[PDB]
Enzyme design. Structure first.
Site, PDB file in Angstrom:
ATOM      1  N   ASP A 119       3.471  -0.366  -1.456  1.00 16.42           N
ATOM      2  CA  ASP A 119       2.137  -0.105  -0.933  1.00 16.42           C
ATOM      3  C   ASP A 119       1.838  -1.134   0.170  1.00 16.42           C
ATOM      4  OD1 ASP A 119      -0.269   1.814  -2.532  1.00 16.42           O
ATOM      5  OD2 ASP A 119      -0.857   0.495  -0.887  1.00 16.42           O
ATOM      6  N   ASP A 120       0.587  -1.295   0.540  1.00 11.14           N
ATOM      7  CA  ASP A 120       0.247  -2.239   1.562  1.00 11.14           C
ATOM      8  C   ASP A 120       0.847  -3.637   1.372  1.00 11.14           C
ATOM      9  OD1 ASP A 120      -2.967  -0.701   1.831  1.00 11.14           O
ATOM     10  OD2 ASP A 120      -1.422  -0.594   3.323  1.00 11.14           O
ATOM     11  N   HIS A 138       3.536   0.148   2.776  1.00  9.95           N
ATOM     12  CA  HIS A 138       2.639   0.913   3.640  1.00  9.95           C
ATOM     13  C   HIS A 138       2.149   0.129   4.832  1.00  9.95           C
ATOM     14  CE1 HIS A 138       1.314   3.899   0.204  1.00  9.95           C
ATOM     15  NE2 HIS A 138       2.595   3.978   0.494  1.00  9.95           N
ATOM     16  N   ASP A 153       0.677  -3.469  -4.054  1.00  9.47           N
ATOM     17  CA  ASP A 153       0.181  -4.207  -2.893  1.00  9.47           C
ATOM     18  C   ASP A 153       0.550  -5.678  -2.964  1.00  9.47           C
ATOM     19  OD1 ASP A 153      -3.151  -2.775  -2.317  1.00  9.47           O
ATOM     20  OD2 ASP A 153      -1.442  -1.820  -3.262  1.00  9.47           O
ATOM     21  N   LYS A 168      -8.181   1.676   8.343  1.00  8.41           N
ATOM     22  CA  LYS A 168      -8.737   2.834   7.708  1.00  8.41           C
ATOM     23  C   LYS A 168     -10.174   2.569   7.316  1.00  8.41           C
ATOM     24  CE  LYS A 168      -6.389   2.728   4.131  1.00  8.41           C
ATOM     25  NZ  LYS A 168      -5.790   2.942   2.782  1.00  8.41           N
TER      26      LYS A 168
END
Ligand SMILES: *[C@@H]1O[C@H](CO)[C@@H](O[C@@H]2O[C@H](CO)[C@@H](O)[C@H](O)[C@H]2NC(C)=O)[C@H](O)[C@H]1NC(C)=O
Ligand SMILES: *[C@H]1O[C@H](CO)[C@@H](O)[C@H](O)[C@@H]1O
Ligand SMILES: *[C@H]1O[C@H](CO)[C@@H](O)[C@H](O)[C@@H]1O
Length: 336
Positions: A175-176, A197, A154, A232
């Site tokens: 990832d994010d 992501h 991340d 989310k």
């Protein structure tokens, strides 16, 4: 009388007595944090040459900031190199080797970080728990992780913060790009996100703080990532997500979801069934465009019964991918 430190011990021992600090090519010992938390209020910290870290399978963090009215910067050519491939094993935080957290911008207030240049973090790059901080022109280059087993790398993980302004970040990872688990008055603009992501709110819930409010994510790009824009929230938990704005986001080569907002996460994965304890309201999407790969879904909204409301959706113009036939309880202002 700039204080120049060539070792982690010097820094930790002497930083509080210095108003101007130079961290010169520090090789931080294995299993140790480069501890800058006792930095003097109002001081300037400058990273010079290559900052490195010894190998140990431990939890970190590798670098810890702390203090108020700080100014943190990089000298020309300087880099903070995690040499993460030593740990990378395709499992990140889910298994395999114990991998250390990288940079903690915790217990920091009214400070500005500029031009911070980072390469190859073991797992997540920056953990932000701060008040009124500007994080400008960061480069978090974990691109080596694509072929060397990077996972959970991340860019910025944000929680328990108020007033975090990210400008001009470049994040190449697995990832994010950003993940806002909680916070108030958080902005990310002029960003370039690749490989990962996407630009995410959440997962929200099950923590000490489960409130996200007043977030603006704008004028940014997301390329070759699983998701573009994402919110989310966790199944059967409580919290609140509100006043979120996504504006002028351009996507390319998105593989999973253009825009995805879902209230069904449990144990890090979607269950397919949303719940209603984390309302997502006052969400504005204004200008999300770009391209999706063949197996991507343009928009996926999986809300609980009555738990998403007051959305203002316009300028969503995506090309490629598929249209979802699985959306639930979509707010009147929006569409899959
Ligand atoms: C939501 O967030 C923004 C910050 O992202 C807050 O607005 C600012 O407040 C000061 C007041 O002088 C301005 O100087 C800043 O430039 C503003 N920031 C931005 C990005 O405009 C805003 O007030 C928050 N909204 C709330 C709390 O209702
Ligand atoms: C940083 O490290 C120094 C010595 O390495 C300590 O004295 C200090 O408390 C901090 O842990
Ligand atoms: C940290 O640096 C200071 C000098 O700025 C020393 O006095 C101290 O012992 C430690 O090396």
């Amino acid at each position: 009388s700039t204080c120049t430190f060539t070792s982690a011990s010097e820094a930790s021992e002497s930083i509080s007595s210095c108003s101007d600090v130079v961290l010169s090519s520090i090789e931080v010992p294995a299993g140790e944090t480069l501890d800058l938390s006792d930095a003097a209020d109002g001081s300037t910290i400058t990273f010079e040459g290559t900052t490195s870290f010894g190998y140990k399978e431990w939890k970190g963090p590798l670098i810890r900031f702390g203090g108020k009215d700080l100014t943190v910067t990089m000298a020309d050519g300087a880099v903070i190199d995690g040499d993460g491939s030593r740990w990378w094993d395709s499992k990140g935080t889910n298994g395999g080797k114990t991998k250390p957290k990288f940079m903690y911008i915790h217990d920091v207030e009214d400070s500005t970080f500029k031009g911070i240049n980072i390469k190859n973090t073991p797992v997540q790059a920056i953990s932000v728990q701060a008040t009124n901080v500007h994080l400008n022109d960061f480069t978090i280059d974990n691109s080596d992780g694509d072929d060397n087993g990077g996972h959970n790398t991340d860019g910025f993980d944000i929680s328990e913060s108020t007033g975090v302004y990210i400008s001009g970040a470049t994040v190449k990872n697995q990832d994010d790009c950003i993940a806002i688990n909680s916070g108030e008055s958080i902005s990310f603009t002029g960003g370039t996100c690749s490989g990962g992501h996407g630009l995410s709110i959440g997962s929200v819930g099950g923590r000490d703080d489960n409130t996200v409010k007043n977030v603006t994510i704008s004028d940014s790009t997301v390329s070759n990532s699983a998701n573009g824009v994402r919110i989310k929230t966790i199944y059967k938990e409580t919290g609140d997500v509100s006043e979120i704005t996504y504006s002028n986001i351009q996507l390319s080569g998105i593989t999973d979801y253009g825009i995805v907002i879902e209230q069904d996460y449990e144990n890090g994965s979607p269950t397919g069934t949303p719940s209603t304890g984390i309302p997502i309201t006052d969400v504005t999407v204004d200008g999300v465009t770009g391209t999706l790969e063949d197996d991507a879904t343009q928009v996926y909204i999986l809300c609980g019964d009555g738990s998403c409301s007051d959305w203002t959706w316009s300028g969503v113009d995506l090309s490629g991918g598929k249209t979802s036939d699985k959306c639930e309880n979509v707010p009147s202002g929006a569409s899959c």
